[PDB]
Design a protein around this ligand. Structure first.
Ligand SMILES: [Zn+2]
Ligand SMILES: [Zn+2]
Lengths: 330, 330
């Protein structure tokens, strides 16, 4: 079997639906005149354009059939997160979005699994929604990797992860709200430079802060896009830890020894990069994920893993066995 | 023989010397009471602490002897760059610093080679200083990777590279003035996350802008710290180029085919990372560099390359043959 655990959806939100939350900043879906194409919209401005797989579960199942994908795990498009909104409205939005998600999966719940969003700007509302959404059928949570200047080392975010650990709630960490300022204006550089750095920063924030010494081993947490540049730059981190006490202040063993505390997806778009990723993380900690249905995703889902020279046993773990245990999928 | 082409020096600048340029922002060297240790100072504030190899060429030669380093190429500590200063004062500073550099190397010019800094905020003064410093004995230029929000795709920086290409002046691009804002305050995260992303951004800015279609092939340009995360994230860039026209707008062939237009040093602190780097760049485009004498450099210079499983022929190119041709060292 084949599980793709990194994909996105966007719900059929109407303009008036979104305006009952925020006419200016709540996103909504316009399935335009040709109907094949949408804008995610913000207010009446256009946000970015999308196509039908994002919103149509029937159309998506036929593509999954064609790709040979048996089970796809899907979650919010990050524009849905609403982390800057007033907390109570953000909690109402998260519940609505997560209900939308379960309705998406209800067309074929054996083949479409969903993860939930949470109002991460209020720790109490976010823990309550994580528990509520998983009890209603979600298999885990997808969060952005940072909340403004608060990275994953911040006690509020560590506490959210620890809540999920203690309740057996898996987490997918997705880069969002990219660093860079007024640079990287062209050629989608935020997706090529800032996004892998954001994910590396999230992983290193947990490691170098000592958070894994405090978060229970029960935490199942995965980072998108192969963990960004984390695995390649890990030697540089270990060398810094060895030679500067301020890099060691909160992290009692070499940073690379914490790779047994998290997972990555396999979306690194290159055979050598995947071999290095599996070398660093272990065949038990890399899961097939495509970023379907976005253009910077993998067109032939699983093609990189399937055409690799990894062991047949490792190929099965990455394509199916790891996600099956991580998300409890049969 | 062994050439280390990535290292730094800082000159014996006195507080009054620096104040004749800028009492607040010109850096200077305080060889403190125990004399083993300095602060680079800024005004009367402390900038950061350094040790004697940075400023003492005699002491440095004995360490090079112990390490088995025959020739070391050395250049300004980036705090010396002065890219935010008024241009004419910055040009006076660059000339003074580059004279300081040649005095450093004059104790043993066969074993200590220097690269120059330039007042990059004025293209004309920067080209004139590049030519002047190379004519006086410098083997090339070291620049920061960006000038504020101007990355290497900016016409002014492309024109500086093209000047150097046309005059057979090699360039080392070093990350500096790191992105990140108010994040990455702890555990030297700017050096672990922001620095490799800065260097990747510089390389991708040249590639995706089409600059290599305009800059002559004669350009010899090397990027520090293995090119940052560039080689690992290259598959993701090629995939984006294939699937979004705005990533292709200015770059007429797959981004990965431009690796024959630049070099990287070998400082990636991990055997698998070095194997991937050589796979991507080619054994002819990776040069031994240590980041001596800084703590996030390589303590045993050349140890990673020498203990690798690369061919004996590839080991010689990386340790000596490539830098010898790149910088014209005998
Ligand atoms: Zn995604
Ligand atoms: Zn350096």
């Amino acid at each position: 079997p084949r599980i793709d655990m990194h994909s996105h959806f966007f719900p059929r939100i109407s303009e008036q639906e979104a305006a009952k939350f925020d006419a200016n900043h709540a996103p909504w879906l316009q399935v335009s005149a040709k109907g094949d194409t949408g804008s995610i919209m913000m207010g009446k401005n256009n946000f970015r354009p999308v196509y039908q797989a994002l919103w149509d579960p029937a159309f998506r199942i036929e593509e999954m059939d064609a790709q040979g994908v048996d089970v796809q795990v899907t979650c919010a498009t990050p524009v849905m997160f609403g982390y800057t909104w007033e907390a109570n409205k953000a909690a109402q939005w998260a519940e609505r979005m997560n209900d939308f998600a379960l309705e998406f999966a209800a067309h074929n719940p054996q083949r479409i699994k969903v993860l939930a969003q949470v109002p991460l700007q209020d720790l109490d509302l976010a823990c309550k929604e994580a528990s509520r959404a998983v009890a209603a059928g979600h298999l885990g949570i997808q969060i952005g990797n940072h909340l403004g200047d608060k990275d994953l080392d911040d006690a509020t975010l560590e506490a959210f992860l620890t809540h999920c650990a203690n309740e057996d709630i898996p987490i997918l960490v997705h880069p969002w709200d990219m660093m860079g300022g007024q640079r990287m204006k062209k050629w989608m550089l935020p997706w090529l430079v800032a996004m892998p750095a954001e994910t590396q920063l999230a992983i290193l924030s947990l490691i170098l802060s000592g958070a894994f010494e405090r978060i229970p081993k029960s935490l199942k947490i995965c980072f998108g896009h192969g963990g960004g540049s984390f695995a390649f730059l890990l030697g540089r981190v270990d060398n810094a830890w060895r030679h500067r006490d301020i890099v060691r202040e909160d992290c009692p063993r070499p940073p690379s020894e914490y790779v047994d505390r998290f997972f990555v997806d396999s979306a690194v778009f290159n055979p050598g990069a995947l071999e290095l990723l599996v070398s660093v993380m272990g065949e038990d900690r890399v899961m097939l994920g495509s970023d379907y249905p976005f253009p910077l995703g993998e067109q032939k889902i699983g093609g990189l893993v399937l055409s690799s020279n990894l062991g047949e046993s490792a190929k099965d773990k990455i394509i199916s066995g790891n996600a099956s245990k991580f998300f409890n999928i049969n």
